[PDB]
Amino acid sequence: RYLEEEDGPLMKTIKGSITGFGAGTIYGTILATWKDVPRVERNVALPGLIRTLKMMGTHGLTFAAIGGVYIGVEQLVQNFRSKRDFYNGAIGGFVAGASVLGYRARSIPTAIAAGATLAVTSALI
Amino acid sequence: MDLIKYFTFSMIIFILGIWGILLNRRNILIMLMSIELMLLAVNLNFLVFSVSLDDMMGQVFALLVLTVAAAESAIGLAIFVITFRVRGTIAVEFINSIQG
Amino acid sequence: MNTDITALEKAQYPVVDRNPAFTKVVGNFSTLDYLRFSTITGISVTVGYLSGIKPGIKGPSMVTGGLIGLMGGFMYAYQNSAGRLMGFFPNDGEVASYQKR
Amino acid sequence: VKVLTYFGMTLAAFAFWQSMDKVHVWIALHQDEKQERMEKEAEVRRVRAELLRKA
Amino acid sequence: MMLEFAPIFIYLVISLLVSLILLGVPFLFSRFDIRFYLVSILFLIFDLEVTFFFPWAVSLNKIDLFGFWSMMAFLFILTIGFLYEWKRGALDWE
Amino acid sequence: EALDKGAIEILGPYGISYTFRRLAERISQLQSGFVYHYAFAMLLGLTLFVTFFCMWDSLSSWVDNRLSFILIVSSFYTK
Amino acid sequence: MASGWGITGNKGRCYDFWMDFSECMSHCREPKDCTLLREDYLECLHHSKEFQRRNRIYKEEQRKL
Amino acid sequence: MILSVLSSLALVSGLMVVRAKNPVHSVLFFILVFCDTSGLLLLLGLDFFAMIFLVVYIGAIAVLFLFVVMMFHIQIAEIHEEVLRYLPVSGIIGLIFWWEMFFILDNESIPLLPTQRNTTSLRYTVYAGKVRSWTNLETLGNLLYTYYFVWFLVSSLILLVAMIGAIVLTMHRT
Amino acid sequence: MFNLFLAVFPEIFIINATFILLIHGVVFSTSKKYDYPPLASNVGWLGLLSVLITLLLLAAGAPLLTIAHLFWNNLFRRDNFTYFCQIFLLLSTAGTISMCFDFFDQERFDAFEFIVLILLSTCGMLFMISAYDLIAMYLAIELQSLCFYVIAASKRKSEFSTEAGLKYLILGAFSSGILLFGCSMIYGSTGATHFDQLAKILTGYEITGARSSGIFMGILFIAVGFLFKITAVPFHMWAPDIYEGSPTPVTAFLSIAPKISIFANILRVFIYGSYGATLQQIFFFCSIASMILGALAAMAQTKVKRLLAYSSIGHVGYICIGFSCGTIEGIQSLLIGIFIYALMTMDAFAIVLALRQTRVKYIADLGALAKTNPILAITFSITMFSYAGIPPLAGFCSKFYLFFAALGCGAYFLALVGVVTSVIGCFYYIRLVKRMFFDTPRTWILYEPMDRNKSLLLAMTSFFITLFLLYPSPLFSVTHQMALSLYL
């Protein structure tokens, strides 16, 4: 069922960071487009584009950090311990969630909640 | 390469309708016109395919879709008129009361 | 215009006439058919009268309701008569009159 | 817009459509590599499911 | 054949040129009326009626009685619409 | 205090009501009352359908299914 | 071209192929039994294999030049 | 080449429909997109549809749009917005739709590449079809009112609804 | 020749009766002699009679609706599935009409054209059910949609009604254009629009490596249009705004009949055509999104109409779970869920229309209703517990299936979503029971008693809701019949 791949832990981490950046760029574009423009900005176009691109870059960065650290810690767990399970990975989701989303939200309870949610989500898979 | 060129003509009109929706969040009249551009592109698709397949069903449906497009435009502009008459303006900030 | 009366589900009763003419189906109207016709028409006239009192048009409303009922009752009676002649409905009397004439 | 602006946008669109013609010819020229790659991926799946049922 | 449309195009170009010569030689020396919407709607409906008549009129010799009566039913529906519009005062401009 | 009216409440009825009230508040704000947002949502759904159910043949080279769902849930902890 | 009505007032170019495929499928309880007729109909619709073969010829001509 | 000219005219005219500041100009550019479509239909040999697109889209529908838009006297402030910020989202959406749909036929309808050989000599002519040829008009009229008459009548019902709804929504009798 | 039209007798009758009513209304509403009488209730009673006569003609002519099936084949297809679907649609329309007379008389909504447009849309949905070709399907869908656009804007001086109509026209025309683009792709790729031809072309292959992308995207776009029609997330945001902004009898009608007709279309198009997995995954993912989003958004609502709109979105999610599984029991359960949701919604909107005489708007307006009208508070509590799926009320039946398919098609994430969203739904439904029974407000609203039509309809639907699980055999048998008749 899974016998179509070539793997490579470093390649896995790089590709995951790249995919995370792409998804974060798409998400940032969507969020920037949903929002209205500040009233002081309705009559001038360029600052709106700058804010859209800034949102794109910031979301690409945070999503790339999550999508990289998740699999990086997943392999660095399954490499040293060298056991394949859903446990290996629950730790990666937790550390990605905690670190990145707590650096972003600046809150420790938010870090714990985000890591827990990512842990359950990666556990189901 | 004839079929691909006619097809891309119609496809560009369809994409222009989509972009016109995307680009006119303050202009609801242009949104209605973008929808009419999409409908025109679909009609073209049916006619081109009818020719390409030597089949008449694409032409029958093109005529009927014409009737539908006319009816849609008449009703759409009637609703636009009563919306404007009630509010005095067409600005999108006056048609956002229903929410949640 | 090419036509084909053939139904998806075959008639379960003796087929007296596959495609009976309009006047033949009308002439096949039975006592029960006229009872259905009259009941539908009378109910429709009554509804027209009763719903017309408040706007003040009970007479014209009566005529309108009666027209709707006349069309619906005639269509229902025709439906039953033609179904009997075609074998789709139980058609004892149709077969008894057919086996004799 | 100015009339010259409409003319210039038309020229640019004409160039875009000729570029699309080149893209279509490129896609038409690579039908055989698509077919040969598809030969492999479908046959790999066959040799695969056949081997997976030998046990 | 579509060959006969090419002279129409060349004719259009020449008409354009004549228009510009005539127009250019001298450069050398808040109240919405719903009745216009209503007339537009009526025109659109009957425009579609003329459109559906064009194939019918050229095809009458093949469609025979079936085609005639289907067009009559079509007209009957649209004429009921017309009578509705008439009784509602959409045809009055005073 | 620490268990019955503490952690059990927080990891139970008291916390569950809080988080679901915030989730309901946020989901309600999506229905913004702007027709442009409804068309944008329809267009995004169309684009998402096309992308996932047709353009998902060569992506599996660079992506994994695990990452995808991870990022969707992680989007909830933004701003 | 499954309806039969051609755009110039005659039988459609691909109607006979459609009818062959349909008549085969009406009694063959397995769709794979009518695969050849199905791809005949679709080939009539789009001329994919014919044009692919002619493009092969053109490509070989360009290669030998 | 000719298809490239018509495609370019339609592309510019459509951009002007969706990007003009003034909605009256937008309706006028829409008339140009319909004229170009009529030209394409003439190329396909469908002269009835080419004329009907002129009669219905331009002669009747665009007129209604023009009457309504002109009498509305829309002010540019009520509908103005800067569109530079939408270049990325337009880019992604349009690029996905482009890469996926401008090339949807390519696998199914492979183009015949033009060679340096006269392939016109292999056109086979069948004269039997040419004895009494049918126009687009009579070919369509052979079907509309007999084999497919129910859809014709349903379209009449659609038109009736349009007339009723127009009267009911807007009529204020003097 | 005349006997061929026996297959279209119900439609012929209803269309001609609609014309008669249009003429009668316009002639006597303009009459100075009768002082321009309001004719909305008169034409309403005559139209209800017309619907009941149409129902008589259709149900008593079951074998005759299949006469001349080859002559009528290129236009429509009448079978047992269509027979029962059309009977149910006519019953829904009759109930909805009977629920409107108090609204006509007390608000003085005098426009009889309201009834005419409802009847014309009923014709359109009748043609939708028997549609057997993409062309006919689209035409019938457009007729129904245009009637709804016009009736959504019927209160033409109200800001809310004009706003509802405008959003409906734009989002509805957009979705219709998307669906029409899908039909064009399918036609171009297969040269066929008839459902039988599409069946033959597409069966046996699905995605056989060399998949026609044209067919696949035609299917995707048609599916997007259908999902807009059934208010599945993420194509749903038009529904709560239009449901609120439209006049309440319009909201009641839009809640039931279009769903019956569009689900008939979805069955006959997808279950019958053959692209397979992707089509069902579409509906699987949209069902999950609908359940979650409907539950949360309903939990956030403070107005009765919005709560009902979001509840309907959640329930279509539950129903579409049945279409996702793609088995005989899936179709049967979809049909059972549709029937029970329709009866429950008719109950709920009968109560809402009864309370609209004193202008109910907020959930808090129902405070102390168990004192001012105890039997109405019990009837409404029964409806809310039925909506929540508490056994042995009829609402349990649909909930039971959700978990039956989740453990049948082997899907435990679906099961978990169902458990959580069921709990959330139970909460926001029992909040209304708390408001009517447990609260002691300082200011009470006294409500006018309802008319006879709504009391009789409410009594019957409430008896059904409490007592269906005692004698559920006929619905089970008839839905099994319909599920089988989809293929044979």
Q: What's B80's domain CATH number?
A: 1.10.287.3510
Length of chain H counted residue by residue: 174
Residues of H with CB below 8 A from I177's CB? Answer: none
For F77, the closest of A70, A105, A122 (CB atoms) is A105
CB contact (8 A) between residue G3 and residue B56: yes
Task: Name chain E's partners: 3 or more CB pairs within 8 A.
Answer: B, H, I
Nearest to I76 by CA among I196, I158, I253, I178: I196
Q: Provide the H-helix boundaries in chain A.
A: 9-34, 46-80, 87-105, 108-123
Number of domains in chain B: 1
Cis peptide bond N-terminal to H23, omega within 30: no
Asked if residue A30 lies in contact with residue F45, where contact means CB atoms within 8 angstroms, the answer is no
Which sign, positive or negative, has the C-alpha torsion I213, I215, I219, I225?
Answer: positive
User: What whole-number distance in Å separates Cα of residue D38 and Cα of residue D28?
Assistant: 16
Strand-pair partners of I133? I194
I156·H169 Cβ contact <8 A? yes
Residue G10 CB partners (closer than 8 Å, separation 6+) = H129
In a domain, B34, yes or no: yes
Closest to I177 in 3D by CA, of I145, I151, I131, I212? I145
**What is the spatial distance between Cα I373 and Cα I377, in angstroms, rounded to a whole number?**
6
Sorted by where each starts, the structural domains of chain H and their CATH numbers stand as 2-169 (1.20.120.1200)
Tell if the CB–CB gap between F77 and A19 is shorter than 8 Å: no
Resolution of the PDB structure in angstroms: 2.8
Per the CB < 8 A criterion, the answer to whether I84 and I442 are in contact is no
In this complex, whether C and B touch, counting 3 or more CB pairs under 8 angstroms, is: no
Nearest alpha carbon to residue A28 among A62, A56, A47, A50 = A56
Q: Are G60 and H117 in contact, with CB atoms under 8 Å apart?
A: no
Asked if I386 and I393 count as a contact pair (C-beta separation under 8 A), the reply is: yes
**Which residues neighbour I94 within 8 Å (Cβ) at sequence distance 6 or greater?**
I48, I51, I52, I55
How many angstroms separate the first and last alpha carbons of chain E? Answer: 50
3-state helix, strand, coil in chain I (%, to 5): 75, 0, 25
State the smallest CA–CA distance between residue D41 and chain I in angstroms: 9
Question: Which residues share a beta bridge with I194?
Answer: I133
Neighbours of I476 (CB within 10 A): 13
Nearest C-alpha of chain A: how many angstroms from F46? 14
Chain G residues within 8 A of B55 when measuring between CB atoms: 1-3, 5-7, 12, 14
Cα–Cα distance for residue pair A124/I284, rounded to 1 Å? 18
Q: How far apart are CA C17 and CA A34, in angstroms?
A: 69
| Residue in A55, A48, B27 with CA at minimum distance from that of residue H85 | A48
Note whether I23 contacts E80, CB cutoff 8 Å: yes
User: How far apart are the C-alpha atoms of I281 and F53, rounded to whole Å?
Assistant: 9
From the list I70, I67, I215, the residue with the least C-alpha distance to I132 is: I70
Residues in Cβ contact with I386 at an 8 Å cutoff, skipping those fewer than 6 apart: I344, I347, I393, I394, I395, I465
Q: Judge whether C66 is closer than 8 Å to chain I, CB to CB.
A: no
Is A16 near chain F, with CB under 8 Å? yes
Are F and I neighbours with ≥3 CB pairs closer than 8 A?
yes
Name chain A's partners: 3 or more CB pairs within 8 A: F, H
Separation of alpha carbons H152 and H145, rounded Å: 7
To which H or E segment does residue E92 belong?
A: none
Residues of I with CB under 8 A from a CB of D: 209-210
* I212 three-state secondary structure: coil
Domains of chain E: 5-88 (1.20.58.1610)
Show the domain range for B38. 2-87
A93-102 burial by CB neighbour count: b if 16+ within 10 A, else e?
A: bbbbbbbbbb
- Residue H18 contacts F, CB cutoff 8 Å: no
Q: Which two tokens stand for residue I84?
A: 């029962």
CB of E40 closer than 8 Å to CB of B80: no
For residue I181, which residues of chain F lie inside 8 Å, CB to CB? none
Closest CA relative to residue A94, chosen from F70, F23, F78? F70
Which chains contact I through at least 3 pairs of Cβ atoms less than 8 Å apart? B, C, D, E, F, G, H
* Helices I159-190 + I238-245 axis angle, to 10: 140
C73, burial (CB in 10 Å: exposed 0-12, middle 13-18, buried 19+): buried
CB of I22 within 8 Å of any CB in chain E? Answer: yes
**Distance (Å) from the alpha carbon of H131 to chain I's nearest alpha carbon:** 27
- Give the 3-state DSSP-derived string for D3-52, with helices as H, strands as E and coil as C: HHHHHHHHHHHHHHHHHHHHHHHHHHHCHHHHHHHHHHHHHHHHHHHHHH
CA angle in degrees (0–180, nearest 5) for I327-I328-I334: 90
Rg (CA), chain H: 22
Other Cβ atoms within 10 Å of I34 Cβ, number = 14
Q: Show which of residues 16-35 on chain D sit within 8 Å of chain H, judged by CB atoms.
A: 16-18, 20-21, 24-25, 27-29, 31
The answer to whether residue B98 sits within a structural domain is no
Whether the CB-CB separation of B73 and H57 falls below 8 Å is answered with no
In a domain, B99, yes or no: no
* Interface-testing mutation among I73, I119, I120, with chain H (most H C-beta atoms within 10 A): I120
Owning domain of residue I4 = 1-488
How many angstroms separate the CA of residue G34 from the nearest CA in chain D?
21
Residues of chain E with Cβ-Cβ distance to H75 below 8 Å are none
Task: Give a yes or no: residue B100 inside a domain.
Answer: no
**Could you give the number of structural domains in chain I?**
1
Nearest beta carbon to residue I188 from set B45, B96, B97: B45
- Angstrom distances, CA of residue I216 to CA of F55, F56, H148, I185, I274: 12, 14, 28, 9, 11
Query: Residues 23 to 82 of I: which have CB under 8 A from any E CB?
Result: 23, 26-27, 30
Sequence-separated contacts (24+) of B77-80 with Cβ below 8 Å? B77/B32, B77/E37, B77/H64, B77/H65, B77/H68, B78/E37, B78/E41, B78/H165, B78/H166, B78/H169, B78/H170, B79/H169, B79/I149, B79/I153, B79/I162, B79/I165, B79/I166, B79/I169, B80/B28, B80/B29, B80/B32, B80/H68, B80/I166
Nearest 5 degrees, angle CA I465-CA I469-CA I473? 115
CB contact under 8 A, G45 and I194: no
Assess contact for A32 and H90: CB atoms under 8 A.
no
Residue B30 lies in a domain: yes
Mention every residue, 6+ apart, whose C-beta is less than 8 A from residue C71.
I13, I16, I17
Question: What is the least distance, in Å, from the CA of G10 to any CA of chain H?
Answer: 8
